[PDB]
Design a protein around this ligand. Sequence first.
Ligand SMILES: CCC1=C(C)/C(=C/C2=NC(=C\c3[nH]c(/C=C4\NC(=O)[C@H](C)[C@H]4CC)c(C)c3CCC(=O)O)/C(CCC(=O)O)=C2C)NC1=O
Ligand SMILES: CCC1=C(C)/C(=C/C2=NC(=C\c3[nH]c(/C=C4\NC(=O)[C@H](C)[C@H]4CC)c(C)c3CCC(=O)O)/C(CCC(=O)O)=C2C)NC1=O
Ligand SMILES: CCC1=C(C)/C(=C/C2=NC(=C\c3[nH]c(/C=C4\NC(=O)[C@H](C)[C@H]4CC)c(C)c3CCC(=O)O)/C(CCC(=O)O)=C2C)NC1=O
Ligand SMILES: CCC1=C(C)/C(=C/C2=NC(=C\c3[nH]c(/C=C4\NC(=O)[C@H](C)[C@H]4CC)c(C)c3CCC(=O)O)/C(CCC(=O)O)=C2C)NC1=O
Ligand SMILES: CCC1=C(C)/C(=C/C2=NC(=C\c3[nH]c(/C=C4\NC(=O)[C@H](C)[C@H]4CC)c(C)c3CCC(=O)O)/C(CCC(=O)O)=C2C)NC1=O
Ligand SMILES: CCC1=C(C)/C(=C/C2=NC(=C\c3[nH]c(/C=C4\NC(=O)[C@H](C)[C@H]4CC)c(C)c3CCC(=O)O)/C(CCC(=O)O)=C2C)NC1=O
Ligand SMILES: CCC1=C(C)/C(=C/C2=NC(=C\c3[nH]c(/C=C4\NC(=O)[C@H](C)[C@H]4CC)c(C)c3CCC(=O)O)/C(CCC(=O)O)=C2C)NC1=O
Lengths: 160, 160, 160, 161, 161, 172, 172, 48, 162, 162
Amino acid sequence: SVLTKAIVNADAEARYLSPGELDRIKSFVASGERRLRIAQTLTEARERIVKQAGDQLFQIRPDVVSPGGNAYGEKMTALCLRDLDYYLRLVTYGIVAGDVTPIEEIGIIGVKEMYNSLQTPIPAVAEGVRAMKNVATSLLSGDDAAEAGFYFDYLVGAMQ
Amino acid sequence: SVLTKAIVNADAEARYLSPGELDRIKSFVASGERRLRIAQTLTEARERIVKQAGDQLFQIRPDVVSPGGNAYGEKMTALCLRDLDYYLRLVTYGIVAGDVTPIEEIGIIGVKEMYNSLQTPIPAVAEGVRAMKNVATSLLSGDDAAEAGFYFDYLVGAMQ
Amino acid sequence: SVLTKAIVNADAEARYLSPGELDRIKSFVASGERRLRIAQTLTEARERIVKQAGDQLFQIRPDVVSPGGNAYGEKMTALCLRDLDYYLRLVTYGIVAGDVTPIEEIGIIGVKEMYNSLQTPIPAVAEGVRAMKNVATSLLSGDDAAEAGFYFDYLVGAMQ
Amino acid sequence: MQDAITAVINNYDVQGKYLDGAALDKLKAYFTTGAVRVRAAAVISSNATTIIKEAAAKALIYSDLTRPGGNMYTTRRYAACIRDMDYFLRYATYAMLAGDPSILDERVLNGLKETYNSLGVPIAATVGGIQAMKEVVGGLVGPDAAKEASIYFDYLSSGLS
Amino acid sequence: MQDAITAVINNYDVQGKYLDGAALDKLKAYFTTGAVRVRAAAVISSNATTIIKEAAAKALIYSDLTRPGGNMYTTRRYAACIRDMDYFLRYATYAMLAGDPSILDERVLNGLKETYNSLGVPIAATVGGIQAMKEVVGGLVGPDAAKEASIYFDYLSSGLS
Amino acid sequence: MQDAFTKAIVAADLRGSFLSEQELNQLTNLVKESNKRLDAVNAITGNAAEIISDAAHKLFAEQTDLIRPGGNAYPNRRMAACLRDMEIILRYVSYALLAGDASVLEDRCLNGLKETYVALGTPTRSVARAVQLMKETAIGYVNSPSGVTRGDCSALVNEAATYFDKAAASIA
Amino acid sequence: MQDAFTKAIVAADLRGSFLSEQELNQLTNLVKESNKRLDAVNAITGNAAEIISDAAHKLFAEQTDLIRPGGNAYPNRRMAACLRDMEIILRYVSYALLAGDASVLEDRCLNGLKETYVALGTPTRSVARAVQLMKETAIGYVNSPSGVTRGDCSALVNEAATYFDKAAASIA
Amino acid sequence: DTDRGIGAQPAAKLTFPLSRPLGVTSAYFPSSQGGAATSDGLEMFTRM
Amino acid sequence: MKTVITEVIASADSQGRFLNNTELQAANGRFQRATASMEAARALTSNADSLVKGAVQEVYNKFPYLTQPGQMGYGDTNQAKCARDISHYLRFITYSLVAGGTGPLDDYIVAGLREVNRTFNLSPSWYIEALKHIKGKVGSQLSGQPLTEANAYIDYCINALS
Amino acid sequence: MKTVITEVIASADSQGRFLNNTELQAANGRFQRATASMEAARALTSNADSLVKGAVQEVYNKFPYLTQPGQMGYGDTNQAKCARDISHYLRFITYSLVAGGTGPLDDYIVAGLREVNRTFNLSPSWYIEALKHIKGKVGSQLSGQPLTEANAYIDYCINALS
Ligand SMILES: CCC1=C(C)/C(=C/C2=NC(=C\c3[nH]c(/C=C4\NC(=O)[C@H](C)[C@H]4CC)c(C)c3CCC(=O)O)/C(CCC(=O)O)=C2C)NC1=O
Ligand SMILES: CCC1=C(C)/C(=C/C2=NC(=C\c3[nH]c(/C=C4\NC(=O)[C@H](C)[C@H]4CC)c(C)c3CCC(=O)O)/C(CCC(=O)O)=C2C)NC1=O
Ligand SMILES: CCC1=C(C)/C(=C/C2=NC(=C\c3[nH]c(/C=C4\NC(=O)[C@H](C)[C@H]4CC)c(C)c3CCC(=O)O)/C(CCC(=O)O)=C2C)NC1=O
Ligand SMILES: CCC1=C(C)/C(=C/C2=NC(=C\c3[nH]c(/C=C4\NC(=O)[C@H](C)[C@H]4CC)c(C)c3CCC(=O)O)/C(CCC(=O)O)=C2C)NC1=O
Ligand SMILES: CCC1=C(C)/C(=C/C2=NC(=C\c3[nH]c(/C=C4\NC(=O)[C@H](C)[C@H]4CC)c(C)c3CCC(=O)O)/C(CCC(=O)O)=C2C)NC1=O
Ligand SMILES: CCC1=C(C)/C(=C/C2=NC(=C\c3[nH]c(/C=C4\NC(=O)[C@H](C)[C@H]4CC)c(C)c3CCC(=O)O)/C(CCC(=O)O)=C2C)NC1=O
Ligand SMILES: CCC1=C(C)/C(=C/C2=NC(=C\c3[nH]c(/C=C4\NC(=O)[C@H](C)[C@H]4CC)c(C)c3CCC(=O)O)/C(CCC(=O)O)=C2C)NC1=O
């Protein structure tokens, strides 16, 4: 979280938290209810989001869903949307934690090696995530949509 | 600052800033005008704040200003308030930076060795700082007084 | 410029600028807006000016554009007008600088050797420049037309 | 390193001055542009790889540089070159967030000119790789941030030449 | 060397561009400050000797520098030092007239840091001699010209450090 | 529908506050450049037919397959549809240019357009190209018109380009 | 629809002629007084509700039969229709006033209106009176407003009256 | 378009289609390829 | 959102033609008028705080009984929601001033007004009286065409409530 | 007949609505613009005679063959009806200038144009070339916003014919 990150840096330098570290915990916790609302809205529309991302993806890359494509077929496509459902879930976790610790251990560290083995094209997974940003972001107020958007762009960043 | 701290951690792990790191920069910068007002008020009353800390100090420790005391005499007392003026200045710097980097390099790292040489009683310097908190804090709104208070308690903490 | 020329003479004699040198900088800078207007007008009509210089040239020397002529053919003529476009550009630079430093380093020092290699008849390039003077000069007030004319006659002079 | 804010604090600390009106005005001039810097960094970070690819495509590859005898010939050296490109992009993003070029001197430019002379790395070609990434960046980040991102790419490139 | 105006001409020449609106705006920004630059140069030139004397008095002499063991000990070295001072003043006056620092690089800074290291000439002390002449200059030339003169003294002094 | 002011207002309202002197002056500048904007929109209107025609001539010069049987701009009916779409897109680009905002272009014209063309078998890459050609010529006209006062229109030429580029990107 | 210029143009065309220097300057004068005209139209718009309300209060003060059972402004449904017609007529009078020509009023509002009311049993003389009261109050507001540079706004009024008087005459 | 199969009739088709936000492909660098396209200064002049 | 530019663009789209002169001419008006509009906007913006407190109070001074117990001008929450509501109106007035049309008022306050006020037992009379007061004070913050603009929109709200 | 005034009134009427600040701002554009428009109108009006003879001739100079026997630029009646037709166009241009919109052009020349020209074997190319010529000469009778206005309407006719 913001808490975990602050503390780990504190303990590693053998010291109490800084004024800065204390301030960010305070600003973070003040945004608690708002962050929880952002996760709720997105949890509430998960099935819609995953799907509109999936349409946006297959237009932009009809090949992935083509003879020599990693997601070619009905059940190679079913697993692909399931992976898109996984990452949206992790994005809700990140938003309520206020950093990526959880998102990272669960779904980016090791992701290159996993997908290389499965021969999944990584950059088109990054596209599926942009597609989810676009849908999710259209169900949130301007301010909340930006706050959510940072976590989408992080995942897009880590698959790189 | 908050900026320096965030970036140094970013560069050291060879990466772009986290959602968390970006969020704190945003919350920090939003408090800019407020933090600048807190520094202004205290800069504007600096001479008063020193004098009231100095009275509070000599009541609580009349000995420091006594035959075998580090601050005994008119010019051993003049330098003592000058040191109190130094630390109030550093506290205004810290408040506008949103962390201690500047406060630390300028006036705590090496402070034990400096004062041990001069044979200055460190814990009574910590008292002089508490005394300044009390005065400064009475010239600030509740919310701003707390925000200022964290930086006073840090210095008190570092002389320990 | 006028500045560069004045200064270089100053520095080379290890001295501050003369009253004379200071006066010419003052008279020069007063003509700034006017000189900028002269360059604008000519920049604004560049395509027309080359087309009319090029007609005036081929009447006077139909041979250059003849079997054994340097500019014989459609693309040997295209490059020829492009060179006329180059020199008009340099003339606008010279007018705004108030001397030839720039015009000289860019397009006269080395020009004999360049064109001798290409076997371009130099004196007919000088004619192309006179032709441009005639056109450009018909788009400027009497006073501005003279001021422009000095720089055209310089280029005509240097190709000699 | 230093940022806008610590640049001011250290300039006053050496004079032992409390922050005065002139100082406070400078810091405001930073804070007031802060939100825009953050948004711009998020665009650059999330388009990092595409910026390098479009910058290389306009300014490096399809050339003698990538052919035998060229410095970015071999997969080894091609990899080293776009690795470098990522450094530049990433650090320029730091400089622009900080609103101070000091990090570009401390952690990127110091000794780099001679390092490149010693390996044979073509300086002029590297500058074009920097100014092509700037071009791409300025499109992606928009009116708000274009000028501010741009300057630290220009800092980088006059640091080599 | 280059001045404001030739800086622009050469920047466009390498692109083979006729001067456009952005260029023309830059040149105007120079011409519009031109008369003030001239007046300022006439004040500096005619007070040259007094500026050096007041700058030395505030920042160099009455010190260990002028005493045995000091670098401006001996009439020889005292003469060399105020000779240098005159160079700085004179060239800064050129840079300010030109509205371009390029002459300060070409004819003053290039190799000077190492020249001073090789002779033992104290760099920090020389910078103070530069920033003291700036202080005097800024009084003599007035509101009109103070900021513009000042920058080329600051260019000189960060060129050594 | 939004224009550049309306956009400002919507963002302000989402904060629940008034204009941030920031936004006010951005809009004061739009009013400052509005005569130029009117000339720029007028440049397109005054040459609409030629802009479409010239784009067209050049599109089929490049892609002679479209005018063969089997091609998507054959027979007359299809060519008229293609000429009509060129006009429709140039129209909404001019509207966006008067407005200082792309929304009318995105909402009425670009939204769904790609999927329409794919359903129809209309080659989107060719349509994208026709849009690129309209852009070249349209901007040509914005930059070199009848006795307009001389000044710098590059900011507006860029903005017009992004509207042409939005459309192209959206369609290809 | 006509405005004062359009009217000039139609008469010129019926001669086969470019506008007479006579007609040109009559129209130059309309442009001369157009700020006043805008204030006059604005005076009505800015007080439309009160103009109708005040006319109404006074109409039924005079004609207490309309609000008895048997009366044409009874029950609520009929009163709402009567209030609505007052607004409709005030609206077309303001349009005519912006236009400098009565045609929109005559063509979209007054044409057939009398015969409608007679078919309905609506007492036209009462409707004429309601229009006379709207006129009194409408003309009232324009004269004194807040902070409008002092001058003669007088010439502007008459024309508004003739539009009110057209409507009254047409209906009674 | 009829309801006899359930009787109730279907849930509205266009709600999700109606909602789609505008696709975001920012940055975007254009392409000149394509075929090789003229560059040089000569273009105007040849024309002239 | 109804504004000059938006309206003309919509007209063009419906007609499926081209931004001709009629349209351009109309649009110029909106641009030429921006200076007065935006001066009104800046004055209303910085005085907002006091314009709101002035109008809120005037609602109680004109309807004294509202501030007695059991009434809708009593207790922190009613009086808080009132200030807020007048603040909403002034906010949209400034928006309409900046936008060049009534759009912001039409879309965010007029559409639905009566239904809402009727369900919540809010009398328009209060709001008219808030606005009449705001109109009185804006007489000395502005003059000339900025005042005319401010007035245009204040009156538009009063007529909308009626 | 389309003018800025009629357009805003039409838009108000169709929503059952009084003219508001949006519509009055629009009208101010049309009134502010009248001076340039009417200067163009006066210049086009007094030069009409020669503008017409200039354009008529240019149709024959650009389409030389028209003036040979058996052709449609031959004999007094064709050449007479031509001058008349260009005169009609210039007349409606002046009307559109004075009116503040394209109405006069839309109602009297554009509505029906192609059907008529097609039945009578009249090529638009002639008329475009008449207008292109008129546009060339009007470059030196006017300048600034009067020229822009003249141009707006001449170009409007050329687009109507393409
Ligand atoms: C001797 C060591 C060495 C190699 C191998 C090398 C490869 C190399 N392949 C390239 C492009 C390319 N290479 C391919 C190759 C393929 N496309 C496919 O889908 C297939 C999997 C594959 C063919 C079997 C393609 C399609 C491009 C163009 C990619 C682009 O332009 O974006 C480029 C960039 C173009 C250029 O500037 O030359 C290089 C440098 N360079 C080297 O120095
Ligand atoms: C060993 C070689 C050597 C010499 C000789 C030397 C002289 C010397 N004389 C000085 C000043 C001075 N010297 C004098 C001397 C005189 N006033 C008069 O009118 C008389 C003619 C004369 C006495 C006989 C005075 C008055 C000053 C002060 C001038 C000032 O401060 O402006 C100073 C500047 C003050 C300082 O920083 O020390 C130096 C360096 N420095 C050297 O390294
Ligand atoms: C009927 C609707 C309408 C139009 C069309 C209109 C145009 C218009 N354009 C103007 C200026 C101008 N227009 C331009 C436009 C350009 N400059 C160039 O070099 C480019 C080729 C072109 C780019 C678009 C420039 C540079 C000015 C002068 C600067 C300015 O006023 O902003 C002016 C100010 C007066 C003048 O300087 O002439 C008006 C009134 N006004 C209107 O009411
Ligand atoms: C083109 C614009 C336009 C006008 C002007 C118009 C007039 C008009 N007034 C009507 C009715 C009415 N008009 C009134 C008006 C009045 N009753 C009185 O006693 C007063 C004297 C007077 C009010 C001042 C009443 C009471 C009715 C309803 C008659 C009935 O249904 O019995 C009706 C019949 C349709 C309906 O009731 O909605 C029309 C068409 N309609 C239009 O579309
Ligand atoms: C938003 C649409 C719009 C409006 C409403 C508008 C009004 C407007 N009315 C004006 C003048 C005026 N308006 C009036 C009006 C009156 N004088 C009186 O005493 C009467 C009570 C009233 C009669 C109607 C007068 C007398 C002038 C000054 C003379 C003039 O400019 O013609 C002026 C010129 C500037 C000034 O002197 O204040 C403007 C711009 N302009 C616009 O763009
Ligand atoms: C965006 C534009 C917008 C407007 C204009 C708006 C009006 C508005 N006023 C409301 C309530 C209210 N409005 C008031 C108003 C007042 N109380 C007083 O002391 C005075 C008499 C008066 C101010 C003049 C009161 C007391 C309530 C609480 C009503 C209730 O819930 O019982 C509510 C109900 C939701 C809520 O309780 O907040 C709305 C929607 N809402 C909007 O979104
Ligand atoms: C109110 C606006 C209006 C327009 C614009 C108009 C055009 C027009 N031109 C016509 C004929 C004509 N128009 C021309 C035109 C020309 N002949 C030449 O020498 C040139 C090539 C050319 C002039 C550029 C000719 C020759 C005719 C006679 C056609 C015929 O009856 O065979 C006719 C047929 C009725 C008639 O014979 O007069 C119409 C209606 N009529 C209108 O009422």
